[PDB]
Design a protein around this motif. Sequence first.
Motif, PDB file in Angstrom:
ATOM      1  N   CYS A  84      12.476  10.415   2.058  1.00  0.00           N
ATOM      2  CA  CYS A  84      11.980  10.947   0.764  1.00  0.00           C
ATOM      3  C   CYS A  84      11.839   9.901  -0.072  1.00  0.00           C
ATOM      4  CB  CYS A  84      13.241  12.138   0.431  1.00  0.00           C
ATOM      5  SG  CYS A  84      12.964  13.918   0.950  1.00  0.00           S
ATOM      6  N   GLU A  85      13.166   9.018  -0.275  1.00  0.00           N
ATOM      7  CA  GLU A  85      12.999   7.776  -1.168  1.00  0.00           C
ATOM      8  C   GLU A  85      12.294   6.760  -0.132  1.00  0.00           C
ATOM      9  OE1 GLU A  85      14.056   8.878  -3.972  1.00  0.00           O
ATOM     10  OE2 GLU A  85      15.361  10.543  -3.485  1.00  0.00           O
ATOM     11  N   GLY A  86      12.193   5.707  -0.636  1.00  0.00           N
ATOM     12  CA  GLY A  86      11.611   4.640   0.476  1.00  0.00           C
ATOM     13  C   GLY A  86      12.496   4.210   1.617  1.00  0.00           C
ATOM     14  N   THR A  87      13.589   4.503   1.845  1.00  0.00           N
ATOM     15  CA  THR A  87      14.735   3.790   2.745  1.00  0.00           C
ATOM     16  C   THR A  87      14.521   4.126   4.178  1.00  0.00           C
ATOM     17  OG1 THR A  87      16.717   5.153   3.206  1.00  0.00           O
ATOM     18  CG2 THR A  87      16.295   4.450   0.819  1.00  0.00           C
ATOM     19  N   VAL A  88      15.111   3.676   5.098  1.00  0.00           N
ATOM     20  CA  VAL A  88      14.915   3.454   6.414  1.00  0.00           C
ATOM     21  C   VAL A  88      15.902   2.721   7.395  1.00  0.00           C
ATOM     22  CG1 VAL A  88      14.187   1.136   7.332  1.00  0.00           C
ATOM     23  CG2 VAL A  88      12.651   3.015   7.417  1.00  0.00           C
ATOM     24  N   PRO A  89      16.425   3.127   8.444  1.00  0.00           N
ATOM     25  CA  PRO A  89      17.589   2.579   9.341  1.00  0.00           C
ATOM     26  C   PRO A  89      17.466   1.041   9.263  1.00  0.00           C
ATOM     27  CG  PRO A  89      15.685   4.053  10.546  1.00  0.00           C
ATOM     28  CD  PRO A  89      15.597   4.346   9.065  1.00  0.00           C
ATOM     29  N   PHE A  90      18.767   0.484   9.111  1.00  0.00           N
ATOM     30  CA  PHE A  90      18.871  -0.770   8.993  1.00  0.00           C
ATOM     31  C   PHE A  90      19.664  -1.367   9.862  1.00  0.00           C
ATOM     32  CE2 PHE A  90      20.942  -4.121   5.777  1.00  0.00           C
ATOM     33  CZ  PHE A  90      19.913  -5.000   6.587  1.00  0.00           C
ATOM     34  N   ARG A  91      21.259  -1.145   9.530  1.00  0.00           N
ATOM     35  CA  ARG A  91      22.160  -1.279  10.644  1.00  0.00           C
ATOM     36  C   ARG A  91      23.041  -0.215  10.693  1.00  0.00           C
ATOM     37  NH1 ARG A  91      24.786  -5.696   6.543  1.00  0.00           N
ATOM     38  NH2 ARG A  91      24.843  -7.459   7.882  1.00  0.00           N
ATOM     39  N   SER A  92      24.071  -0.092  11.444  1.00  0.00           N
ATOM     40  CA  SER A  92      24.480   1.005  12.067  1.00  0.00           C
ATOM     41  C   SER A  92      25.034   1.999  11.191  1.00  0.00           C
ATOM     42  CB  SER A  92      25.910   0.531  12.912  1.00  0.00           C
ATOM     43  OG  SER A  92      26.005  -0.860  12.820  1.00  0.00           O
ATOM     44  N   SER A  93      25.774   1.457  10.007  1.00  0.00           N
ATOM     45  CA  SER A  93      26.055   2.608   8.955  1.00  0.00           C
ATOM     46  C   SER A  93      25.074   2.385   7.553  1.00  0.00           C
ATOM     47  CB  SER A  93      27.483   2.400   8.589  1.00  0.00           C
ATOM     48  OG  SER A  93      28.048   3.481   7.929  1.00  0.00           O
ATOM     49  N   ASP A 120      21.956   8.121   3.149  1.00  0.00           N
ATOM     50  CA  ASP A 120      21.170   9.306   3.087  1.00  0.00           C
ATOM     51  C   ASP A 120      20.277   9.384   1.917  1.00  0.00           C
ATOM     52  OD1 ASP A 120      20.239  11.855   3.333  1.00  0.00           O
ATOM     53  OD2 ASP A 120      22.274  12.710   2.754  1.00  0.00           O
ATOM     54  N   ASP A 121      19.260   9.659   1.970  1.00  0.00           N
ATOM     55  CA  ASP A 121      18.217   9.706   1.121  1.00  0.00           C
ATOM     56  C   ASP A 121      18.231  10.866   0.119  1.00  0.00           C
ATOM     57  OD1 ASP A 121      16.762   7.377   1.649  1.00  0.00           O
ATOM     58  OD2 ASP A 121      14.990   8.087   1.631  1.00  0.00           O
ATOM     59  N   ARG A 122      18.383  12.063   0.474  1.00  0.00           N
ATOM     60  CA  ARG A 122      18.587  13.211  -0.023  1.00  0.00           C
ATOM     61  C   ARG A 122      19.668  13.287  -1.071  1.00  0.00           C
ATOM     62  NH1 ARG A 122      20.080  19.354   1.693  1.00  0.00           N
ATOM     63  NH2 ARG A 122      19.563  20.369  -0.513  1.00  0.00           N
ATOM     64  N   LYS A 123      19.365  13.884  -2.531  1.00  0.00           N
ATOM     65  CA  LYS A 123      20.063  14.046  -3.567  1.00  0.00           C
ATOM     66  C   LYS A 123      20.748  15.530  -3.107  1.00  0.00           C
ATOM     67  CE  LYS A 123      17.877  10.932  -6.483  1.00  0.00           C
ATOM     68  NZ  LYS A 123      16.700  10.151  -6.319  1.00  0.00           N
ATOM     69  N   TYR A 124      21.879  15.764  -3.768  1.00  0.00           N
ATOM     70  CA  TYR A 124      22.338  17.101  -3.745  1.00  0.00           C
ATOM     71  C   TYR A 124      22.659  17.784  -5.299  1.00  0.00           C
ATOM     72  CZ  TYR A 124      22.395  16.432   1.347  1.00  0.00           C
ATOM     73  OH  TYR A 124      22.133  16.194   2.443  1.00  0.00           O
ATOM     74  N   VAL A 125      23.135  18.912  -5.253  1.00  0.00           N
ATOM     75  CA  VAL A 125      23.345  19.720  -6.614  1.00  0.00           C
ATOM     76  C   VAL A 125      24.819  19.724  -6.575  1.00  0.00           C
ATOM     77  CG1 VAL A 125      23.569  21.959  -7.352  1.00  0.00           C
ATOM     78  CG2 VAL A 125      21.434  20.616  -7.799  1.00  0.00           C
ATOM     79  N   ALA A 126      25.310  19.107  -7.525  1.00  0.00           N
ATOM     80  CA  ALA A 126      26.900  19.142  -7.893  1.00  0.00           C
ATOM     81  C   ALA A 126      27.311  20.175  -8.991  1.00  0.00           C
ATOM     82  CB  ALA A 126      27.486  17.800  -7.995  1.00  0.00           C
ATOM     83  N   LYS A 127      28.303  20.986  -9.154  1.00  0.00           N
ATOM     84  CA  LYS A 127      28.518  21.551 -10.342  1.00  0.00           C
ATOM     85  C   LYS A 127      30.089  20.891 -10.696  1.00  0.00           C
ATOM     86  CE  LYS A 127      27.955  24.994  -7.928  1.00  0.00           C
ATOM     87  NZ  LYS A 127      28.032  26.560  -7.491  1.00  0.00           N
ATOM     88  N   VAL A 128      30.099  20.786 -12.025  1.00  0.00           N
ATOM     89  CA  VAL A 128      31.277  20.168 -12.672  1.00  0.00           C
ATOM     90  C   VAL A 128      32.310  21.470 -12.557  1.00  0.00           C
ATOM     91  CG1 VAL A 128      32.538  19.302 -14.520  1.00  0.00           C
ATOM     92  CG2 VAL A 128      30.191  18.601 -14.251  1.00  0.00           C
ATOM     93  N   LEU A 129      33.426  20.975 -11.897  1.00  0.00           N
ATOM     94  CA  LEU A 129      34.513  22.105 -11.619  1.00  0.00           C
ATOM     95  C   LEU A 129      35.400  22.090 -12.931  1.00  0.00           C
ATOM     96  CD1 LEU A 129      35.731  22.800  -8.243  1.00  0.00           C
ATOM     97  CD2 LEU A 129      36.958  23.637 -10.271  1.00  0.00           C
ATOM     98  N   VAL A 130      35.852  20.996 -13.366  1.00  0.00           N
ATOM     99  CA  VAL A 130      36.781  20.819 -14.415  1.00  0.00           C
ATOM    100  C   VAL A 130      36.749  19.612 -14.960  1.00  0.00           C
ATOM    101  CG1 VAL A 130      38.717  20.229 -12.754  1.00  0.00           C
ATOM    102  CG2 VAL A 130      39.384  20.856 -14.879  1.00  0.00           C
ATOM    103  N   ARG A 131      36.907  19.119 -16.529  1.00  0.00           N
ATOM    104  CA  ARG A 131      36.893  17.832 -16.959  1.00  0.00           C
ATOM    105  C   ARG A 131      38.085  17.851 -17.980  1.00  0.00           C
ATOM    106  NH1 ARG A 131      31.395  17.844 -17.884  1.00  0.00           N
ATOM    107  NH2 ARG A 131      30.387  19.808 -17.732  1.00  0.00           N
TER     108      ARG A 131
END
Lengths: 4, 4, 20, 20, 464, 463, 463, 464
Positions: free
Chosen positions: E265-274, G65-76
Amino acid sequence: XXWX
Amino acid sequence: XXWX
Amino acid sequence: XXXXXXXXXXXXXXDXWXXX
Amino acid sequence: XXXXXXXXXXXXXXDXWXXX
Amino acid sequence: HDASFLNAVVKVYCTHTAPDYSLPWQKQRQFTSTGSAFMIGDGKLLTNAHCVEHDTQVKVKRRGDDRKYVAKVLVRGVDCDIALLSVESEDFWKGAEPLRLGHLPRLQDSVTVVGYPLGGDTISVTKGVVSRIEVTSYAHGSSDLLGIQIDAAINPGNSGGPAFNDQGECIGVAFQVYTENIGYVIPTTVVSHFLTDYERNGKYTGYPCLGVLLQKLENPALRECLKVPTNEGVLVRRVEPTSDASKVLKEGDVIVSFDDLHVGCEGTVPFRSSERIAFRYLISQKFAGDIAEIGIIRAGEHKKVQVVLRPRVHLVPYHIDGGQPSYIIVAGLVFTPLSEPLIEEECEDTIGLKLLTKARYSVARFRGEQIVILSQVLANEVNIGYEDMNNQQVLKFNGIPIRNIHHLAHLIDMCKDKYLVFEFEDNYVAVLEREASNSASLCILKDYGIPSERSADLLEPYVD
Amino acid sequence: HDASFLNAVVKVYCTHTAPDYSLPWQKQRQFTSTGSAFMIGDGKLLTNAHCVEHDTQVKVKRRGDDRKYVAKVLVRGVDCDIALLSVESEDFWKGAEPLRLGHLPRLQDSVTVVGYPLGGDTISVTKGVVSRIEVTSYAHGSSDLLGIQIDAAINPGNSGGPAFNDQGECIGVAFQVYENIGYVIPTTVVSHFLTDYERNGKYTGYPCLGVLLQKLENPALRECLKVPTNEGVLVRRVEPTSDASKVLKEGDVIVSFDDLHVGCEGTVPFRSSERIAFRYLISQKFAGDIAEIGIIRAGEHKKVQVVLRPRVHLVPYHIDGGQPSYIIVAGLVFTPLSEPLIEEECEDTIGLKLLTKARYSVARFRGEQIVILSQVLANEVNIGYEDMNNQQVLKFNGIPIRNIHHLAHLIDMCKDKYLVFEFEDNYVAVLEREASNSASLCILKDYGIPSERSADLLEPYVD
Amino acid sequence: HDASFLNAVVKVYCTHTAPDYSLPWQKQRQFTSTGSAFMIGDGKLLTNAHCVEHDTQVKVKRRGDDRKYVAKVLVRGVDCDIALLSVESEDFWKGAEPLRLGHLPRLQDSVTVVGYPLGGDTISVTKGVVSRIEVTSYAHGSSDLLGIQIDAAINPGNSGGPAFNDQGECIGVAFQVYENIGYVIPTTVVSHFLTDYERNGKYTGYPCLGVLLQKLENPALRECLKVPTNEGVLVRRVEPTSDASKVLKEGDVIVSFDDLHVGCEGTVPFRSSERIAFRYLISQKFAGDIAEIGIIRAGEHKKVQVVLRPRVHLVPYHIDGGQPSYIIVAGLVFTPLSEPLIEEECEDTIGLKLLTKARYSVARFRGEQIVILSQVLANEVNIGYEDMNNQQVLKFNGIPIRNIHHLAHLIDMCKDKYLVFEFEDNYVAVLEREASNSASLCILKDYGIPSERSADLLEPYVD
Amino acid sequence: HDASFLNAVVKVYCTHTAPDYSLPWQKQRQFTSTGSAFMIGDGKLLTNAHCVEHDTQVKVKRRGDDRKYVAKVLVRGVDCDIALLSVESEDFWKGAEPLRLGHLPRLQDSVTVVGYPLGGDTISVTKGVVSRIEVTSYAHGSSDLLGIQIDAAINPGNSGGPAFNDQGECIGVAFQVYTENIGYVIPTTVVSHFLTDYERNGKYTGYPCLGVLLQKLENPALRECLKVPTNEGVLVRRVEPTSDASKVLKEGDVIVSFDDLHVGCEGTVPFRSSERIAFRYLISQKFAGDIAEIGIIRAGEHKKVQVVLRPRVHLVPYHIDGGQPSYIIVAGLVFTPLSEPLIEEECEDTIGLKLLTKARYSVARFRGEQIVILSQVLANEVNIGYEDMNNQQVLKFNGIPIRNIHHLAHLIDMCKDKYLVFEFEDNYVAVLEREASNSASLCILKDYGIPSERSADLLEPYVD
């Protein structure tokens, strides 16, 4: 250069 | 002088 | 051309020119 | 006393101390 | 033992004569600056290009040796900011124990940077960790290459000395320009690329770009509309006309794989293991002329294509190609190509919106294209009314669209006509009489006054 | 009888509430200001347009009277920065002796500006001479008009008070915002503004030729153009919406204007032995006037006729008072680019390309707007498009956008699956139409907002 | 197994929309920011309260990981600047290994902060030692708590990421806004925040003694007070809303606190051989805890018991999220004075007396507010009262005002001829009640406004 | 002829030694400044008070006379900024043709200001009109008196020379402190008031105030509520406890007439034929001790009252009464009265909100009241813990509320008790031991070090  |  | 913003430094967010 | 703003210079609009 | 490593580090003295762009028959004021370099093996010294930039002369001093020696600049990459130097001889290199190049570090790896601070005769050291491995820019607006961030600040005099492991291997070259506490390092991999570039071609061919303007696809509807499955791909918004793409890619293409690595989705891509890395990184690890295989989604259909990758073509260049900027003067009308340095030196105003945008927003339509500007008019009886004209782009000459300044120069010389007609960007038109312009030639450059009507490169013959 | 003249000069108290140009369902913070006005006759007060600009309320106060009164703004010319005011009392106007308007002064003539400086609410006076008479710039609303400079500086509260002769005639209107340089709007401009309004019952505005001009100071240039003498100016460009586009051509040289010879510089005979900018002539006409123009085209003399109208601005300074137009559509807020919008956020976050389009591009047709996305109101439907501020939008579902009303219409008629917006960069935002229509209330019942349009966009659209 | 630890550290994208404190029917301009958070176990993300402050939406992004997710604020918790977040995916938490919380470090201990710097969306790391351990100030929300300083500077995007031991335990939460000085919120504070919330299902907050203290470093001073040794602090003032006002008296000397000896400076034994501010002890208790206090009163030793509760603020920093309260009433806009209000307009137009009341005066009773007139919306009824901004209002028709709800009630019940507001200066504004009730719609259908109250002021009022 | 008038104008040289308020056993740095004065007749010279302020010596120079002469300051009004000087002798005054005082000008009347610019030996002149006749303030926060605005800027060196008619009469005194193009002039009327004040009382008694805090009644409902007919009157919001009002006026009174001149909605009042003037003007034209008749509306009822008018009583004074500020030091604890100059010199911080408001918002509860502050503590073994205490108001001493610093000083001397107990504003309490404080006395002021524990005025006996 002027607009007139 | 501090509030505590 | 035109209507670009050719440098990746003067653009931002999700518009980027790809390369080195 | 207190709750005044005694100088006519640090007050303004329609609140003025009267005199010379 | 330990101090053996520091003995491979060298101090760099360099005298700088830059050209003045505002008046490009002239040079800027000569000054001397200092920096760092180190022995990488063979007879070679590694440094930053900005250390030896516009070198009048370059001198290097061993640690614990009073005498200065004299060095030559073999090759210099401008956008990766690296330069190699050779030294003569036979004494300097005596008993030298050069540095070996380490592999790329991991976050939190201990690093020390070694170099020569501005002022003083003594070497200095800073220790920290690798804080960040990211793609960044090594030269203003130039390119984007991998880089290592470290947890320690670096003295300007300290680039381009070595950045070390705890095993004594050099993990890159320090970089500082001259409110952070964050130092920068050109990594080994960018360095390798430079060295093999040089071995193969015996000159700097640079780092290629894909020639494309990408949009991230985060939004569900975008992806659904484009028929992109799962979470992958970036949308192609624009292509550079001078790049092999645009014969290959089109607006609306979603690049999906690159050399069979999937692009998210963003620009990224596998790089090194983690780890993941911006798509740009793969592109940069190629060489000028290389072909990359690119998985695409066009319409709704998966498709594979090949693309030649070449270094970016900058309509308004940052680097000038070194040396001195071109100029030609007709009837006191002074022309040069628009360049970033020229802009920098003339500052913000007197440049103007129209021109500034062209420099920011415009791409080369063909190889060799320039924006030719009229910088100043040197006042005289032939140009009356045309004085007070500053930083204007010339479009046509006697009806003919101007491709670059060599072209313009070829048109002036071939012109037998009654008038010299210059159409500028505003649609402003300067007309001058040929014969009178010539008679004024010697008189104008005497009085102002300037050695030559041209810069040497425009005496050369013109092609196509 | 001196104090008689002052008694016509009134102090103006005004409360301004302007629109927030980013989200124009809101207003900016009201502030109060003071200024000047004077009695021109009938029941009318003359003042500066900016003194009453976006007025929520206007009060006027007579000299040597404690009471404020309620004035209503009758008419505002924006391009000349003039305004007429009325007051209903029969107090006020009781025992009033309005000013007579005098003719245009000559240099070194004595001048006194009368007005109310900021604070103290007592009248003030300055004296100087007429230092300069020139065509100058008006309120960055730009239309260039004749103007007077005076040897005296003027307090901000003094504009819009009168500038006087030594004969006690008003020679113009003090104009100041915020040197030892005063600026006065001269009687002839005032006069123009009045006769304009006296017809039409409203302000039409000063017209323009619609043409972009180059002086010819260069003999070579003239020879080339086959100009007989040194006179004439060269037409580089012609506004499409002007009548001139049907008559004048790029390359023409204009020579006479209503039989006055235009000089090779931009000039024109003024009065007696004086010379003034060509712009002066055009300005002294009225919208709908026909002017006869002498031109040299190719090498040949010609005569043409052009109808004159007020400049059609692609990016307006005025905004026409009250609420500016907007859309929403799934959190994306759409408004016309305007000059007032361009300074709220001033210059940044606008960007080079926009700013330049605003300073350069001209209307291709009447009613054309540059439509921008000001901001995006974050929400599920728009995820990924937040940020995304101040971007001109070009196409909607393939269709070039003419203006924001056109855009409101294309959206109302849509019925398609996705809403597709192409912006300046070729950046494209795609939205699911249903999801958008379903998120509407939540978005503006949250963020939170009176409605999904500015009221005008409800009316049926044109073509 | 190093990269394992990083995988718990997430990047936080947040869109803030705050209230306009002047006219709180509106909101300020939304902006997006980034920050850090990490996995503490269960389904919970730990981060900085300010990272999610006034959140319209919160997204989190896993490393690699490229994906964003949706968080809800539980307590502040506001006073400790801590927040818990949840995310519903089963993506996300898939293959997660949350952090273990370590104990409080000792000076010179090695520390690494992990987070996401602003821009680039790749994780970062800094290493340093623990330079300082002290009671410090929190988010100008003030409650003073234990804090760690580190030898390393921290990027603004890094707070609220974790600070690590060399054993890989989390020793606290990075805190930065915008040296080479890092600030970390330590595990014990975090711990406190969790057990607080684990009861009550909500954040009660750290308690205070409610007392104003003078050190005794002066032997003369001690002799006078008949202190046996050099120890004890002197009670200058007691907050009325605290339990201490029923127990402690001005002049008392407190000596032990839960059998810990308070030093003649403000100190207290800390751990082993260390000494810490007395405030540390109070802070390590929970609301409703009873503390036993040793005092010297007159010359005689005494023992008292005090219930401990969170400080009752007369002028709040927090605002309790969402919409602040307001009235109108004939264009006069009434809101509670708050700390967030105090910087929109920052310091000016507030004035010396107000600013000082905000920095000094304490609540006389629970729920007391300083009610101000923010501005007046100009209109016929209020003529003469426009201008008139940021003025505390005291009486309404003779009745002292307790808070804005009290004020909303007195107005609803009025029925009298005039509405009479006495403000700070003894400045008095008088309005005709009928005229006001008749101008209501016009005023907010003009200016223009969702309603004449904030929704809470509709509920029935108390006593 | 014309130049005869300029011959009445004199240049003023004055050496200034001011006291330091921050450390008031000391004086500020001695400097010399210049100004203007003119012959008003008799043996007297008129000038601004700020010209001769804190005069160490005062010298005057005739126009076209090389020799300087030496002048004495007869009397000086601080709030109207006027000073009279006498000169000796017999040569200076030879052939002198003094200026006569004109009546008050009308707007647009031509004015010229004559004086001696800073630098140079020559007299200068500026011409303009009377732009504005308004009530303003002549000394920071001090008082409000009538003033004339002119259309021409004035050089600092040019006050306090004369401002002229076109008939050669002096219409006032120029005033400039040291982005306008507006000069200020103290008018003849304020000047007359000063001179007759001096003739009558042989000393400066100042300009009285009504001692009242007024609100404008613009709003209809206000006026209706208060039962005020037509458009007239200002509402009394507050009264000064030290003024004869407050025995006479009450909050809620609407003053309606003053000496049988009606007072409008705003503050104004009939002035001259076409003109109105702020109510303050009438008040200022009185003398200290005078009675004014004031028409009032109380409840709903018209009523007449008499009020004595005295000059404002400033709890935190602007003027110090000239000379040197009081101070007393106990156990190294340094006390002075809070004053505007002290605030000015300590600047904004280190003063603090609580104290600053008191200085802005507070009125004298009785004659002779002061705010006594502890400015610094000079460190020593008796005061340990009390060091680092700055600008704190002292309220009580050994239980007793402190009226002023002479009082505090009288209490210290009468104290036989074990401890010196100081209660400050925060409720902070400093306790010190009497006998040890005394033993430390010589040692503390030696070491710091300071001539005296007091300033002379506090050796004097205390009254009530």
